[PDB]
Design a protein around this ligand. Sequence first.
Ligand code: NI
Length: 165
Amino acid sequence: VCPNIIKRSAWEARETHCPKMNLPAKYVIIIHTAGTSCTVSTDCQTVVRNIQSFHMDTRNFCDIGYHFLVGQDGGVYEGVGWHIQGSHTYGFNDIALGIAFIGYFVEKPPNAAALEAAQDLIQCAVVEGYLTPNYLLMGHSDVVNILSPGQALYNIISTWPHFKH
Ligand code: NI
């Protein structure tokens, strides 16, 4: 089933009212925050909260851009959740679940804990119906010109199921 998942309230997320996400989604997009990483609950909560603020105040997004985030503490963090539209990839925000690893992974990849959490989340997504049974998995850089989710992480997710080979 779905891994733990720490809620928005847990990281003192600014409350908003954003466009709704249309489920089921047809894709999963692996992203990396490209910023600092985190190894313990409190640190990750902080980093996630800062990203929301940055996305809302200087990027003008309606809320944090990712549906979910994954830390090196192996924990899954709720972004805007399953039901809100994302702000992570042009042309895919209404049909793709954006999952972002907290950190910068071009050279070194996320630990096994982080990776496992992602796949378990992905698994419950398709099982729960948040994703179509024939959904497609892809990396950020496959869709737009972006240095995400990092070659290291890319090489990893490229081997997961439903990856758009
Ligand atoms: Ni599970």
